[PDB]
């Protein structure tokens, strides 16, 4: 095995260089030299050794250094630290994929494996962002900010936005990671909050005010998506507002004894009736519900 040793030899140079880049020591390196070595492995049918080597050198760094760095920052500038590790790794992987460019062109697709950058993304995703303790802390930090901003507090909206975008990219041009790690609990947590909110609003004891309070709630949640969250979450958060605050309480809003639609429809409140039509038209059977309470009333007169 002497061709073994030659290829081991070339891998050895690369691995060393890769590690320097990981420690941001790249200035001393030669792009020509590194690219040429990487090219020579693939050219000689050893793309697998190169590919599986790249996997270990990147996995080793993320486990040992990047993750420890993040775990050192729970409850201590956690988001800034995660985002900083995210940017460093993006910069590193951009240098690395380029040195291994020949591989992305000649080996990767032909062998049904992820290109270099995406293999990079997959490891960051699985080793840092989805490490047990980090994943928990990311999720509750984000949710806790949203829940406090709801209550009046002022929170870093940029930080949330950076965290979401990251989750997006980690899903490989799809929303699977953002959805599972952030969106699914966001809605679930949001639903709990709205249902509680509906109980407050119903103490205020006016239909038109409940209806207005809901109109403003939908708008707050849309402006929060546009500014903090992935835009693909707009419709989903709007459906939960509508379910929790309209579909689950619509008969109760419509048949209210003094402020109910019948009360409006006799006390000549055209605007309020209008505000009520706009809101109920959003959900299944919302108008059918209004038309029913109206119909009984119209029927009763004679």
């Amino acid at each position: 095995t002497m061709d073994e040793k030659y290829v081991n030899s070339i891998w050895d140079l690369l691995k060393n260089a890769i590690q320097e880049i990981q420690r941001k020591n790249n200035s001393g390196l030669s792009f020509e030299e590194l690219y040429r070595n990487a090219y020579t492995m693939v050219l000689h049918k050893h793309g697998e050794k190169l590919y599986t080597g790249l996997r270990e050198v990147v996995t080793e760094h993320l486990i040992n250094k990047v993750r420890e760095d993040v775990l050192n920052s729970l409850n201590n500038n956690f988001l800034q630290t995660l985002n900083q590790a995210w940017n460093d790794h993006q910069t590193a992987m951009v240098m690395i994929r380029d040195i291994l460019m020949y591989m992305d062109r000649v080996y990767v697709q032909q062998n049904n494996v992820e290109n270099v950058y995406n293999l990079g993304l997959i490891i960051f995703r699985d080793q840092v962002v989805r490490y047990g303790c980090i994943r928990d802390h990311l999720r509750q930090t984000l949710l806790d900010m949203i829940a406090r901003e709801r209550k009046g507090e002022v929170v870093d909206r940029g930080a949330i936005r950076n965290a979401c975008q990251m989750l997006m990219i980690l899903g490989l041009e799809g929303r699977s990671v953002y959805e599972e790690d952030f969106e699914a609990p966001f809605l679930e947590m949001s639903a709990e909050f709205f249902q509680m909110e509906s109980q407050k609003f119903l103490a205020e004891n006016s239909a038109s005010v409940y209806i207005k309070k809901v109109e403003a709630r939908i708008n707050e949640e849309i402006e929060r998506v546009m500014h903090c969250l992935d835009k693909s979450t707009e419709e989903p958060i709007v459906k939960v507002v509508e379910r929790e605050l309209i579909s689950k309480h619509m008969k109760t809003i419509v048949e209210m004894e003094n402020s109910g639609l019948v009360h409006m429809l006799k006390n000549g409140k055209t605007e309020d009736l209008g505000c009520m039509y706009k809101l109920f038209s959003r959900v299944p059977n919302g108008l059918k519900t209004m038309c029913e309470c109206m119909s009984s009333y119209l029927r009763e007169q004679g």
Partner: protein
Amino acid sequence: VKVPECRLADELGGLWENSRFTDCCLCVAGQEFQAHKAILAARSPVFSAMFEHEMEESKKNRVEINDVEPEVFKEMMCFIYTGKAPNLDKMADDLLAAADKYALERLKVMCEDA
């Protein structure tokens, strides 16, 4: 009225062949050649990356290549600047290797025709 034929490949050729306004140096087999970073970068993603990063070549404006015969290099450069490979047929095997290494697709196909 008669529009003269396009002269872009020939005018650009002039920068390569007369070393006018060069910004980088390529040392091949101990022979120094002057080139233009933008032109190499535009025509090769390999050269483009090479001059995009904070690596030695970017820092020194100089590239050390020991893997390509200089007459083959001089012809690769010729295609990079002009899109023409006049001496292709007497070096087709080696010009091929070089073009595949520097991601010069049309040249790789031109060479493959032997």
